[PDB]
Design an enzyme around this catalytic site. Structure first.
Site, PDB file in Angstrom:
ATOM      1  N   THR A   1       0.875  -1.204   0.000  1.00 16.29           N
ATOM      2  CA  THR A   1       0.000   0.000   0.000  1.00 16.29           C
ATOM      3  C   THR A   1       0.884   1.216   0.000  1.00 16.29           C
ATOM      4  OG1 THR A   1      -1.802  -1.021   1.283  1.00 16.29           O
ATOM      5  CG2 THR A   1      -1.704   1.434   1.234  1.00 16.29           C
ATOM      6  N   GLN A   2       0.559   2.161  -0.866  1.00 15.55           N
ATOM      7  CA  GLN A   2       1.217   3.438  -0.833  1.00 15.55           C
ATOM      8  C   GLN A   2       0.177   4.512  -1.010  1.00 15.55           C
ATOM      9  OE1 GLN A   2       0.788   1.547  -3.482  1.00 15.55           O
ATOM     10  NE2 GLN A   2       2.661   1.382  -4.725  1.00 15.55           N
ATOM     11  N   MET A 107      -1.467  -6.634  -2.495  1.00 15.92           N
ATOM     12  CA  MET A 107      -1.604  -5.397  -1.737  1.00 15.92           C
ATOM     13  C   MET A 107      -0.513  -4.396  -1.987  1.00 15.92           C
ATOM     14  SD  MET A 107      -4.440  -5.683  -0.283  1.00 15.92           S
ATOM     15  CE  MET A 107      -4.679  -4.762   1.192  1.00 15.92           C
ATOM     16  N   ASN A 108      -0.097  -4.316  -3.218  1.00 13.91           N
ATOM     17  CA  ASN A 108       0.950  -3.394  -3.630  1.00 13.91           C
ATOM     18  C   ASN A 108       0.664  -2.919  -5.052  1.00 13.91           C
ATOM     19  OD1 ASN A 108       4.490  -3.705  -4.448  1.00 13.91           O
ATOM     20  ND2 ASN A 108       3.360  -1.893  -3.753  1.00 13.91           N
TER      21      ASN A 108
END
Lengths: 233, 243
Positions: A1-2, A107-108
């Site tokens: 996550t970003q 999740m990226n």
């Protein structure tokens, strides 16, 4: 996550009788700071495909390298690399969609919304969308971000359904696209006046236009607007 | 003795016999060559027509690495393909970190270190190919040849495979008769001739000629296959000289 840092705004596109058009402005924003003013967000792949990208610019630059590496690789041990075994818009899309969904599943995500516009070997128009979630869809007109809210309504008045496509010339479609870009410039706070536009036509191939500007802007009526209610002067 | 039964074993005279035996597989292969010209390189290879049933033009042998490098080899074809696959990974990883396409001398050492690694252990076998490769980078044209030992040097011209001796002498004449250099177009013609000449040591079967080139002026520094008219014209020029 970003979280997205340097970002590009809308990409807009539509089908017409002989091909597809796609457009995107040349800005890379840094929050509300209009930081970078010559960013190309339409990336041609060969002579039959243009991939337009919004969202995070660092991820866009990564995707751009993936596409370049795709072209290199497809040419390996491939005598028909510039003929029957050239990359199709549909191959390029499916690949990007696979990558986007995979990245979301880990999740990226690659923090982007992408429209792949092109023309297939058999002359068919290709237009399809994919985003950071791996969600994909097709429509006679496609737009990301603000463009989805403001460009689509306008573009859909030209091509409202599949049967409108053969009645739509490249002149009518381009003019519709150019008007939508003006409207976005009026109403989107993270847009710029400068944009690029690409036409992929089954007869005339890929026309790539840089350094276009929004023109024919209406501002004169502003001189008459005073106060916010009761002020006369 | 028994020194030649296991790779990486030094014989009492300081030799690695398994590598020397790899060279025998190379010497047994078809002839392949490269010619460094004024602003580029040309690669050519003899493809033996084992039968009528081989589809002409269809079993391509010269291989591109990245977009600016050509590779050709003689010996065990699968070994050469394995080496080029590795070269493609090395080129990709170089370009990924450093941005710029891999320079030819840098690429030469990547292949060299990998081939040399296969002479360090008895759990692997040396490569049964000699590889001629090169292209154009920011400092100009480069031609290399790499042997089963991992040994490589830069060349003016190079040849390997069964017709290597004949090709060499031809290549030496060109070096002597043109100190100023050869144009890329001249080099293509010359390459066609030299493969035709070298095909004597292989006369049993007919063959099919295959040429490629990268030239600053002629291909924009990209590796391209010589096809159609330009290929025919080089075949004709070769036919003439063997007549």
């Amino acid at each position: 996550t970003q979280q997205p840092i340097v970002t590009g705004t809308s990409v807009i596109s539509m089908k017409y009788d002989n091909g597809v058009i796609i457009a995107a402005d040349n800005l890379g924003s840094y929050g509300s700071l209009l930081r970078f003013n010559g960013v190309e967000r339409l990336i041609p792949v060969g002579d039959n495909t243009v991939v337009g990208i919004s969202g995070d610019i660092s991820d866009m630059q990564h995707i751009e390298r993936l596409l370049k590496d795709l072209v290199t690789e497809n040419a390996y041990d491939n005598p028909l690399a510039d003929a029957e075994e050239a990359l199709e818009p549909s191959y390029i899309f499916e690949y990007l969609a696979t990558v986007m969904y995979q990245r979301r599943s880990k999740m990226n995500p690659l923090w982007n919304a992408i429209i792949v516009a092109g023309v297939q070997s058999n002359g068919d128009q290709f237009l399809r969308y994919v985003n950071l979630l791996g969600v994909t869809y097709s429509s006679p007109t496609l737009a990301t971000g603000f463009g989805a809210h403001m460009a689509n309504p306008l573009l859909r008045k030209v091509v409202d359904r599949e049967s409108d496509i053969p009645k739509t010339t490249v002149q009518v479609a381009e003019e519709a696209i150019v008007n939508a870009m003006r409207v976005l410039y009026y109403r989107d706070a993270r847009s710029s006046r400068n944009f690029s536009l690409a036409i992929i036509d089954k007869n005339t191939g890929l026309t790539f236009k840089k350094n276009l500007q929004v023109e024919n802007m209406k501002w004169d009526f502003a001189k008459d607007i005073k106060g916010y209610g009761t002020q006369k002067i | 003795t028994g020194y030649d039964l296991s790779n990486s074993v030094f014989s009492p005279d300081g030799r690695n016999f398994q590598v020397e035996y790899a060279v025998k597989a190379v010497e047994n292969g078809t002839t392949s060559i490269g010619i460094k010209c004024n602003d580029g390189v040309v690669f050519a290879v003899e493809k033996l027509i084992t039968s009528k049933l081989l589809v002409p033009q269809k079993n391509v042998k010269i291989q591109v690495v990245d977009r600016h490098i050509g590779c050709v080899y003689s010996g065990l074809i699968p070994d050469g393909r394995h080496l080029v696959n590795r070269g493609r990974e090395e080129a990709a990883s170089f370009k990924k970190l450093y941005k710029t396409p891999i320079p030819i001398p840098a690429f030469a050492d990547r292949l060299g270190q990998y081939v040399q690694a296969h002479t360090l252990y008895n759990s692997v076998r040396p490569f049964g190919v000699s590889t001629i490769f090169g292209g154009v980078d920011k400092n100009g044209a480069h031609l290399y040849m790499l042997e089963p030992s991992g040994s490589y040097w830069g060349y003016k011209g190079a040849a390997t495979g069964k017709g290597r001796q004949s090709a060499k002498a031809e290549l030496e004449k060109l070096v002597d008769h043109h100190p100023e250099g050869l144009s890329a177009r001249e080099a293509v013609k010359q390459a066609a001739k030299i493969i035709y000449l070298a095909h004597e040591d292989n006369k049993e079967k007919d063959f099919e000629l295959e040429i490629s080139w990268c030239s600053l002026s002629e291909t924009n520094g990209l590796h391209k296959f010589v096809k159609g008219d330009l290929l025919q014209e080089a075949i004709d020029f070769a036919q003439k000289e063997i007549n």
